[PDB]
Amino acid sequence: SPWFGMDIGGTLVKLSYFEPIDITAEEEQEEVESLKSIRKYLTSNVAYGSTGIRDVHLELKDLTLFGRRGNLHFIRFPTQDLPTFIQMGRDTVLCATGGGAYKFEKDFRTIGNLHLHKLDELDCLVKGLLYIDSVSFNGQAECYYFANASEPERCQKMPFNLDDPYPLLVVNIGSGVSILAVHSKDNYKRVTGTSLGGGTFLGLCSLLTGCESFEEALEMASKGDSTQADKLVRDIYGGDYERFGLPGWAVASSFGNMIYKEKRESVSKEDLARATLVTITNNIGSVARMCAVNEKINRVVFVGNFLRVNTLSMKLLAYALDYWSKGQLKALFLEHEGYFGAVGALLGLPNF
Amino acid sequence: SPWFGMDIGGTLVKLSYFEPIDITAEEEQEEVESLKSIRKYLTSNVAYGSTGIRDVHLELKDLTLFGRRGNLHFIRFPTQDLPTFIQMGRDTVLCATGGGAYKFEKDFRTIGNLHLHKLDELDCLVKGLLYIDSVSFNGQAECYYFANASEPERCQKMPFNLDDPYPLLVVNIGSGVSILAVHSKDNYKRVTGTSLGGGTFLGLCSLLTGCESFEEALEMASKGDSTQADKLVRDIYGGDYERFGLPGWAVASSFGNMIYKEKRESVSKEDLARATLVTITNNIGSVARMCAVNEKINRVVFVGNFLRVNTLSMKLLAYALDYWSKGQLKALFLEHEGYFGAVGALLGLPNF
Ligand SMILES: Nc1ncnc2c1ncn2[C@@H]1O[C@H](COP(=O)(O)OP(=O)(O)NP(=O)(O)O)[C@@H](O)[C@H]1O
Ligand SMILES: Nc1ncnc2c1ncn2[C@@H]1O[C@H](COP(=O)(O)OP(=O)(O)NP(=O)(O)O)[C@@H](O)[C@H]1O
Ligand SMILES: O=C(Cc1ccc(C2CC2)cc1)N1CCN(c2ccc(Cl)nn2)CC1
Ligand SMILES: O=C(Cc1ccc(C2CC2)cc1)N1CCN(c2ccc(Cl)nn2)CC1
Ligand SMILES: [Mg+2]
Ligand SMILES: [Mg+2]
Known part of the structure; x- marks a missing residue:
């Protein structure tokens, strides 16, 4: 089974994939063809379908994870396209977080024998952040x-x-x-x-x-130029609001100049x-x-x-x-x- | 001189006017006609020009202020129309606050012999709030x-x-x-x-x-219905976010459903x-x-x-x-x- 982590958000699905690079000779033989195909599909393409993208520049190379050396890959696509992801998956233990781990739980289980494990969106954020910083960005x-x-x-x-x-x-x-x-x-x-x-x-x-x-x-x-739409402190005071240390350039009212028809017509x-x-x-x-x-x-x-x-x-x-x-x-x-x-x-x- | 207070904001000018009601016989004689005209103009009209409004329901009646009995009146108009206010004033001690007390200081001084005293926008708020609450809203x-x-x-x-x-x-x-x-x-x-x-x-x-x-x-x-434009917690999770006590009806992303073209077309x-x-x-x-x-x-x-x-x-x-x-x-x-x-x-x- 490939090693994925998945965060299904309200807008984007984020996927982390660990590619082993210490595949021995015997291990390669015991590989089921479908497992080889997904590893080749994922590593030989940087665009997946029409909306999936691998962020190649973020790849963590020669990471030791779960006692194996490999590369950690970072992939994203719109949550709107998760049906085509699941459909591609139907023709593995999936640790998933984000709201969509709950919302689409039943959809993931249409994949035969797949085991979905839901994890909390913010426990995962904290542990992921602390881990990536601890291993560094390829030494940077x-x-x-x-x-x-x-x-x-x-x-x-x-x-x-x-x-x-x-x-x-x-x-x-x-x-x-x-x-x-x-x-x-x-x-x-x-x-x-x-x-x-x-x-x-x-x-x-x-x-x-x-x-x-x-x-x-x-x-x-x-x-x-945001100041065409925004009302600034100097539009109200003529300059700084000295008494409370507000500079004339600070926004007093966001979009506040759009209450005037003539300004809406020129923005x-x-x-x-x-x-x-x-x-x-x-x-x-x-x-x-x-x-x-x-x-x-x-x-x-x-x-x-x-x-x-x-x-x-x-x-x-x-x-x-x-x-x-x-x-x-x-x-x-x-x-x-x-x-x-x-x-x-x-x-x-x-x-x- | 009539007793005004004026708050010139970024959008609205607010004016408080104290009308004496204990005008004795001798005091009426010594009234200059222009002073009588402004008191009659202010008290006999509830709309002033095309954009000025007296909020009659807010009037404080039989207030004792500065040792005199009178009524406190509340009047507002758009700051955009302050030029016509000043022009009407050109054909008195004015305590003014708000940003426009600074921005339009030079404009107020086009009124001959007028003395403009600028006061801080938030000192005035505090003292005004505490005063109105202390005298009550006509006993309420x-x-x-x-x-x-x-x-x-x-x-x-x-x-x-x-x-x-x-x-x-x-x-x-x-x-x-x-x-x-x-x-x-x-x-x-x-x-x-x-x-x-x-x-x-x-x-x-x-x-x-x-x-x-x-x-x-x-x-x-x-x-x-704001939920046509907003993305709710239940749109992301399928229901409540239990772990952090977020109800399904809470807004997760304001206007967040407007990222989808089909929803922009039906809102x-x-x-x-x-x-x-x-x-x-x-x-x-x-x-x-x-x-x-x-x-x-x-x-x-x-x-x-x-x-x-x-x-x-x-x-x-x-x-x-x-x-x-x-x-x-x-x-x-x-x-x-x-x-x-x-x-x-x-x-x-x-x-x-
Ligand atoms: N390609 C993209 N498509 C859509 N939004 C993008 C894209 N790139 C950046 N964004 C921005 O990133 C935001 C989504 O960020 P993201 O951290 O992935 O949230 P999410 O997990 O999908 N939502 P949430 O359920 O609230 O945690 C969008 O609202 C956009 O502002
Ligand atoms: N007749 C009205 N015309 C315009 N805005 C109105 C009116 N009635 C209510 N409002 C609202 O009241 C707001 C202005 O409130 P107000 O307390 O008078 O601010 P202001 O003093 O003019 N601005 P500021 O300089 O930031 O203190 C506007 O942004 C509108 O949302
Ligand atoms: O008060 C204000 C805005 C404001 C509102 C009303 C008026 C009335 C008196 C005319 C003036 C100004 N701001 C200070 C704090 N702001 C930020 C921005 C970024 C960060 Cl990181 N922190 N704080 C936002 C601006
Ligand atoms: O956290 C949130 C919104 C939110 C943001 C992101 C997500 C991500 C996890 C999917 C969910 C929810 N809110 C709590 C506090 N809110 C208020 C509102 C009024 C007052 Cl008076 N006080 N607080 C605003 C709503
Ligand atoms: Mg998220
Ligand atoms: Mg104000």
């Missing part, structure tokens, strides 16, 4: 931050050490947002969540601009995509900051796929967390950010 | 809550006593949101704010539905207005709850004009605060909610 740091995020001429990606990783505030930006406080390897809690997450960005963007993909939404946002779709991204990102950062202060944690790590190929939101989070916390909180990021649940599910395999 | 309570907000068959407006009003968390929902912690009559701080406020509701609603007024937006929202403008209102209101409630927990305050009062003629958002806030705090926080509301800054400005008059 898994964790990074943006040094000197206040000054754009100096702001640059730099590695960050998590060898004593506690305590830690984990902000999981998926369809929505879950916020976790991790005090030890076995002591963590979901502090709260917010429903203004990646699905809000993509859903509002699609309604406002007609964009057809996450990447197109980000491409529109990179070209826009571009790119401006609206950027205002949607800025609105969602700032709100996540603000909620993360309040939770950090309440939990007495100064290390805030952001994960989930809202931030994949999304440097605008990462830099916005880095700069805002540092600015609004007066330098007391650090925004941290991880290279394998969308995949920790799928990895943690895979790690549950010896328990079955 | 100024403060109210929704009793038994968990059960709709029982949920009803009930008076609430603020005679020892400290400590208090004040949530000012205007264009944006300011959150204040009030520890004493002279000890208060702005804890934080959020830019997802009333202007976001109105701006997004206008973009999404084409509505032309705040009231039309609320009317559309009353007819919609109604009413559904989108309701999803906008629900999204903004829940986020305000969530931010208010985190601040309350951090400040160790269990009384949360919501003010600002986002909640005027907006019972949907008030009940949503009442129910959500009680549910998510497991009954530890009470949502409180005030009858004069949009006007406390304007009242507090008026109260600054003896200092000049």
Whole structure:
């Protein structure tokens, strides 16, 4: 049986697959052809069907897992296409997490003799995150931050050490947002969540601009000016609000300039995509900051796929967390950010 | 000189006017005709021009202020129309607060010999709130809550006593949101704010539905079903998320169902207005709850004009605060909610 871990989210399915590379001569003979076919299918293709993608750059090579050497692969596809995944599977012990492990439990059992083991979405996140950081990203740091995020001429990606990783505030930006406080390897809690997450960005963007993909939404946002839609402190005060240390450039009301018909008529779709991204990102950062202060944690790590190929939101989070916390909180990021649940599910395999 | 207090916000101008009713015989003779004309204009009309409105139901009658008996009147108009207000004024000591006291300072001084005194937007809010509650709403309570907000068959407006009003968390929902912690009559701080406020509701609603007024937006929202646009916990899990006590009906991703083209094509403008209102209101409630927990305050009062003629958002806030705090926080509301800054400005008059 192949070694998979699967995180079925509200939007994306994430799959971690361990490919053994220490296959001896006798082991190759005893391989059933269907097992050889899936290993060849998975390792010889980087696109699967029309919507599956292997993130080749994330591969962990020559990892020792469960006493065997192999490569750890990272694969994703839309949850909407899980039926075709299951159908392909019908013509193994599956550790699965995420809400879809429950929602589609009966669907997975249409695969004969398949054993589905459901694991909690946030236990898997914690164990997966701690594992990937512990084994490193092929010798490089898994964790990074943006040094000197206040000054754009100096702001640059730099590695960050998590060898004593506690305590830690984990902000999981998926369809929505879950916020976790991790005090030890076995002591963590979901502090709260917010429903203004990646699905809000993509859903509002699609309604406002007609964009057809996450990447197109980000491409529109990179070209826009959010201040065409947003009402700033200086639009209300004429400048800074000195008394409470609010700079004139801070957003006082997101989309607040859209109450005027003449401004709605001159705003571009790119401006609206950027205002949607800025609105969602700032709100996540603000909620993360309040939770950090309440939990007495100064290390805030952001994960989930809202931030994949999304440097605008990462830099916005880095700069805002540092600015609004007066330098007391650090925004941290991880290279394998969308995949920790799928990895943690895979790690549950010896328990079955 | 007439006794005004004025709060010039990003969206609305709020004006409090004290009409003396103990005008003696000699005092009437010494009245300059222009002063008589403005008192008659203000008291004989409830609509001023095309956009000014006197909120007659809020009037405080037979109030003793600055040693005189009179009626306190509450008037509002869009900040966009302040030029016509100033122009009417050109063809007095003005205590003014809000951002527009700074932004339009030079405009007010086009009125000959007028003395403009700027006062801080949040000092005025605190002093105005404490004053109105102290004098009562013509003998009725100024403060109210929704009793038994968990059960709709029982949920009803009930008076609430603020005679020892400290400590208090004040949530000012205007264009944006300011959150204040009030520890004493002279000890208060702005804890934080959020830019997802009333202007976001109105701006997004206008973009999404084409509505032309705040009231039309609320009317559309009353007819919609936000779950057509929002992705719920049960859409992701198939039911409750038991492990972390998340009910199936909770919103996991606001507008998160709008990532699917077929759902964007079947959603109604009413559904989108309701999803906008629900999204903004829940986020305000969530931010208010985190601040309350951090400040160790269990009384949360919501003010600002986002909640005027907006019972949907008030009940949503009442129910959500009680549910998510497991009954530890009470949502409180005030009858004069949009006007406390304007009242507090008026109260600054003896200092000049
Ligand atoms: N190719 C993509 N397709 C869709 N969304 C994408 C894509 N790439 C990035 N995203 C973003 O990533 C978000 C989903 O992130 P993800 O961490 O996979 O959440 P999820 O697990 O599917 N949902 P959840 O059930 O709340 O945990 C989307 O809302 C988008 O903002
Ligand atoms: N007639 C109205 N016109 C416009 N907005 C209205 C109206 N009635 C209610 N509102 C709502 O009330 C909000 C403005 O509330 P208000 O408390 O007056 O803020 P403000 O003081 O003008 N802005 P701010 O500078 O942030 O304090 C708007 O964003 C709407 O959501
Ligand atoms: O966590 C969430 C939302 C959510 C996010 C992600 C997921 C992922 C796991 C699938 C689920 C749910 N919420 C709890 C707190 N909320 C409020 C609302 C009002 C008040 Cl006053 N307070 N809190 C908002 C809802
Ligand atoms: O108060 C505000 C917004 C605001 C609201 C109302 C007004 C009224 C007075 C005119 C002004 C400003 N903000 C401070 C905290 N913000 C963040 C952002 C990111 C992070 Cl990480 N943290 N905090 C958001 C902005
Ligand atoms: Mg997820
Ligand atoms: Mg205001």
